[PDB]
From a paper:
To obtain crystals capable of diffracting to high resolution, the N-terminal residues (1–25) involved in membrane binding were truncated, but the entire DUF1394 domain (residues 26–324) was retained. The structure of each [name]-BΔN monomer consists of 12 alpha helices packed into two bundles running perpendicular to each other to produce an L-shape fold. Based on the structural alignment, we define [name]-B DUF1394 domain as a module comprising two helical bundles in an L-shape fold. The asymmetric unit contains two molecules of [name]-BΔN with each monomer “slotting” against the other to form a compact dimer. The dimer interface produces a large contact area of 1524Å2, yet there are relatively few bonding contacts between the [name] monomers. Briefly, R161 form a hydrogen bond with A192, R165 and M166 binds to Q324, I168 with R320, N169 with S321 and Q324. Thus to test if the [name]-B dimer observed in the asymmetric unit can occur in solution and if it can heterodimerize with [name]-A, we used pulldown assays, which revealed a weak but reproducible interaction between MBP-[name]-A or [name]-B with HA-[name]-B. Overlaying [name]-BΔN:Rac1Q61L complex structure with that of the [name] dimer, we can see that the two directly compete for the same binding interface. This raises the possibility that [name] dimers autoinhibit [name] binding and regulate [name] functionality. The crystal structure of [name]-BΔN reveals the presence of an autoinhibited dimer present in solution and in cells as revealed through pulldowns and PLA.
Author numbering:
A (entry chain AAA): 3 to 145, 153 to 299
B (entry chain BBB): 7 to 147, 156 to 299
Write the structure that this text describes.
């Protein structure tokens, strides 16, 4: 255990304990839909405007929290990748370190997908911040969320899967500043994790210690996580017929789950992927995703 | 030529159809909220798409028309600003082009007032574009969509289009003095104020259709002026007299001019200047 690597483990662990609180905040996000729709439709009504404002300021407090955290997560991940791609694989000598770094990467992706699932099912978030930004521009007449931050946040929340796109960008950037390392070291981290996830899902017998909702829910979300990172940073990507990812098998295990459990995860594959809409991707895997 | 005049009346006849389209605009708000919140239930995703395709048909109409309106104005400015003002000789022609200019601005504000009060339009098209990207998976069957998205992100889309269209015309006719354009705007603004301020309580001049016309046109022209005039419309020594202009607005039944005050808040250039009266900001707040 290096001082550098205990610093990354320290850093990421603070980040990951905060991550459950972020999920709490997002889960309890009411939205200001009602207030805004009425305020907008009766713009002379000075009372309906205070209401909409009152309701929106707290929510944009959370939206700022979420976005700021995404920057912390972004950095935490590129931390992990640096550490967890540099030294070769050692099952005998240095396993505890690898297992520990693998654990934290998986836990990042578990949060990431859970956050994005809830975002995609929240009708309010984009409209809330849209109303905020215009009402901010009214109050600035008579005279902190500065303009350029707000433009970044607007784009963040325009994303189907904000957190996951943040992380695919963060992974694309990592390979970029480490052209010295072969691409395989990163791609093989993602591909092994994807494959191990599939094993834990597929290999266990019916009704063993391995087949609890907690395990299945976790492994599905890590799998889809790393599949999509891989799709972005692997030249040929995840959808090519002889890709080490076997997308077809990954989608099939998703299709095997209760519909409402994994519809968020299927949408991530639809929207936040790079190579899905390619002439060279199986019309069968297209078929499955429409 | 006289074709330019004839090209705008066919446009100004279509404009009244566009407005009744926007008035009848259902919106797919509820349908989409449900589809988003139950993304697995394919029935709700069918419902939402069904409701949305017709609305996005209208949204495409409105944007297309904004292109026609845009060129129509640039024509009118061409015709108006090329010739000296003739009070005697060629007045009928002047008044005719002026009236068409005023009628463009009447539509523009009426469209933008309704847009601003329609909570559906932006969300509708947002859902469309997302759901279009799903269907392109299997190729069930771009540039324009990005244009439309920006258009409908504007507080006052039509008026923004005309502000851009006026900035454009000034730009591409540097040979004409800027005053030739800005004096057209400023005189119309001032004539509008006269029609509103001058007549007695009970007169042939005091009817809703006059007041409602003149307030739109006025707000129209002083916003265009603000964009193209170097000093802008808010300067203490401007022939626009902004303060005086806002006063006639504040004198109205608030619900009938709240759209017009929002235009001034959002679609202006010079409101937020260090050198713009605190009294003028006081009034828009």
């Amino acid at each position: 255990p290096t001082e550098s690597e205990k610093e990354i483990y320290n850093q990421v662990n603070v980040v990951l304990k905060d991550a459950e609180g972020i999920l709490e905040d997002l889960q309890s996000y009411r939205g200001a839909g009602h207030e805004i729709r009425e305020a907008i439709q009766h713009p002379a009504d000075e009372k309906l405007q205070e209401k909409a404002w009152g309701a929106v300021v707290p929510l944009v407090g959370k939206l700022k929290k979420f976005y700021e955290f995404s920057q912390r997560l972004e950095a935490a991940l590129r931390g992990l990748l640096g550490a967890l791609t540099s030294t070769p694989y050692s099952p005998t000598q240095h396993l505890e370190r690898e297992q520990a770094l693998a654990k934290q990467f998986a836990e990042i992706l578990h949060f990431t997908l859970r956050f994005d699932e809830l975002k995609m099912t929240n009708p309010a978030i984009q409209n809330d911040f849209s109303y905020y930004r215009r009402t901010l521009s009214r109050m600035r007449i008579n005279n902190e969320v500065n303009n350029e931050l707000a433009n970044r946040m607007s784009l963040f929340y325009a994303e189907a899967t904000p957190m996951l796109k943040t992380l695919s960008d963060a992974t694309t950037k990592f390979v970029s500043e480490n052209k010295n390392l072969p691409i395989e070291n990163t791609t093989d981290c993602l591909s092994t994790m994807a494959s191990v996830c599939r094993v834990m899902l597929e290999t266990p017998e019916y009704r063993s210690r391995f087949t609890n909702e907690e395990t299945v829910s976790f492994c599905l979300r890590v799998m889809v996580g790393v599949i999509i990172l891989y799709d972005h940073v692997h030249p040929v990507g995840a959808f090519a017929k002889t890709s080490k990812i076997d997308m077809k098998g990954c989608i099939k295990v998703l299709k095997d789950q209760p519909p409402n459990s994994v519809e968020g995860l299927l949408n991530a594959l639809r929207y936040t992927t790079k190579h899905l809409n390619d002439e060279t991707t199986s019309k069968q895997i297209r078929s499955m995703l429409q």
